[PDB]
Amino acid sequence: QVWGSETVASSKVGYTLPSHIISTSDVTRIINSSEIQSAIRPAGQATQKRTH
RNA sequence: GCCCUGAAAAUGGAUGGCGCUCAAGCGUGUUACCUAUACUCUACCGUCAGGGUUGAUAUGAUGCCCUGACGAGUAGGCAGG
């Protein structure tokens, strides 16, 4: 009641709970899930071989 | 051309000094040699730029790795400690 929700507004005048700029806090889950992994080029080596 | 006269200033003194006379002087030529924080190569430090790298079961993604170039400095500005 004191801070409000999606049903009770805030119990404070003109106040709403803050919104998120990103829907999840796990960036690794987004990268690997289904769609980015099908649109990205194959990976490298994580360390380049010293040439010449 | 060289040398000499012309050419006299005050502490004792200045091709830098010693000294040098078919020079160790002058003009000119042939080479050899001496080595600067310059150049070339290599290592390391930092800076800048271009790239690679979030796959899960490990520790830093302002992280790690690759490659190239660069490095003077008062007044002054900025950054990291």
Side-chain angles (χ1 to χ4, degrees), chain A residues 1 4 8 15 17 20-21 27-29 31-34 36-37 40 45-47 50 52:
Chain A
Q1 293 179 356
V8 298
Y15 184 78
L17 275 172
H20 297 260
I21 68 176
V27 67
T28 64
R29 184 176 176 87
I31 289 184
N32 307 348
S33 67
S34 178
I36 294 88
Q37 289 303 305
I40 54 170
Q45 198 154 109
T47 181
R50 276 186 86 208
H52 177 264

Side-chain angles (χ1 to χ4, degrees), chain A residues 6 10 13:
Chain A
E6 313 71 8
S10 163
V13 301

